[PDB]
Amino acid sequence: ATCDDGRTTANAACCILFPILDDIQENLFDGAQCGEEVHESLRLTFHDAIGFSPTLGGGGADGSIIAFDTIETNFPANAGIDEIVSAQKPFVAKHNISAGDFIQFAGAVGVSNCPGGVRIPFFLGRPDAVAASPDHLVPEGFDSVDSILARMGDAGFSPVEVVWLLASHSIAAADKVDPSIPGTPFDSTPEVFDSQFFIETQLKGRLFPGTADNKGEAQSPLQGEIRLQSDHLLARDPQTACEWQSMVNNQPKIQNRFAATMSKMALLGQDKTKLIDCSDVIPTPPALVGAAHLPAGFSLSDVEQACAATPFPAL
Template identity: 60%
Template structure:
């Protein structure tokens, strides 16, 4: 039996263990749950300017950078496996950009670094903040949480931390599992590819998107990746690329494999008709990613600084014009592929995201 005095003592100890949280009015007039978050209201407009206030190339690259920085983490290797979301990719750029998996991150790193230095915030905090703000620029996007207080990185992440498009599913799931992610969480993180584009798989077609709506966090990516590939958007097959079903759309080999693997296919297919599940699971997986290498209890919740996305109501996922169930390579044996409508009009052709 637990006595009242013991319960009271436990509550006092729990209260003392928690950091002091004091709601504050910041110098700019904003209110926040913790005064330590006020600096991020100053950072916010500079990040929005960097992103051109749109879900464009800088937003795509900023979201990508959150992953490339944070995934340098290993449960098996411990400290030698990298510090997770610690900003090491920005602090030790010369080392980490030697890893081919980080090709194409140099531009956004060099755009972000001066802003982080201007506001005297750590690179680890800044990278995750910029990624959360970037997502808020996209239509119908998630509202990512942002925790601040990461210390500066002390070492570069090791090579082979970042899964690559050329990797098979076993390799990808093993690497992500070593960072603490389940196969279902891997699929959830890939919702980011609904607002993504490539620069380095085929440099001749800079900015080719992975789905037909690269400024919208919708389920089209999960539909279109399951369609039979018929063409390449550029000069032919490149390492890490397979044929896609839509002119101008680039399909990563790894996306195509994960969409069809029995360990991930049903979760992949489920997002086609459950946009809210996709959003919620992406938010949860991104919180986990953004705090890799840190105790979340040691960080300060500054999520109220992140702008809310527009919350646009999206149409249901559908087949692109001229395509139908006959073009689907369904791989989930447990659940039939959903019945979808086909968009009217001629076959889709996607314009590439312009270079900045």
């Protein structure tokens, strides 16, 4: 189909996304940058979608974190999410799409701004949310591995799919884990969707980049990086360690698995056969240029190898 401004997309119902694309690239992502607003929007896709439990309810990727913000931003695991919920709300009021479509659309557009990134498949048509998520369904940085895997398993994700979704922490920082150092990132390249996150979490912890006593924080290997206790444990746990290592220096697998498992997350609570595919509206991401690496001056003896089947690669 050809839309009114002459841009084309495979399914004509998708034409309505083009003005919304332009508005968010200008006014939400500050001129299509891979910056804080993109990271916050990507985190919002997960905090919206994961509100889904067969036994308790929640409609998953349904926009409930905006439509019922009053309730869901009270949950302690949503700390800090209110800023990006407030920022997105006027876009939803002004355009003609549901909050659940908007959150996943903004997350996929945001990701496409980051070098190395992918186009997450995007479907249009989710109805407005009809219930707030239940409480206590969002994993925290201080939860054990078994707790996190049980929660993600309960929403439909295997342990390998959790590892794949955690490539999101390649373009990510924390504001609330240690409030004295907000904006400190989880890897050395928070503007680049690459395997540095899986590398650098495998390094021996050395110091705390701000204060020492913060709940859900492990020691970081670098003054300018922060480490969640969850990522520290998942990189080392026999249930996830070999998968975590396998992402290192494996950008094709990161890209393939992150797109497919993000599309699955974006569809929790929904049925794709009732929606329309508008994947082709998402911009084309830049590619990587630089090779994966240990941080300069580090070597294999600084890596805590945790996969008995396969040694950590020589980078």
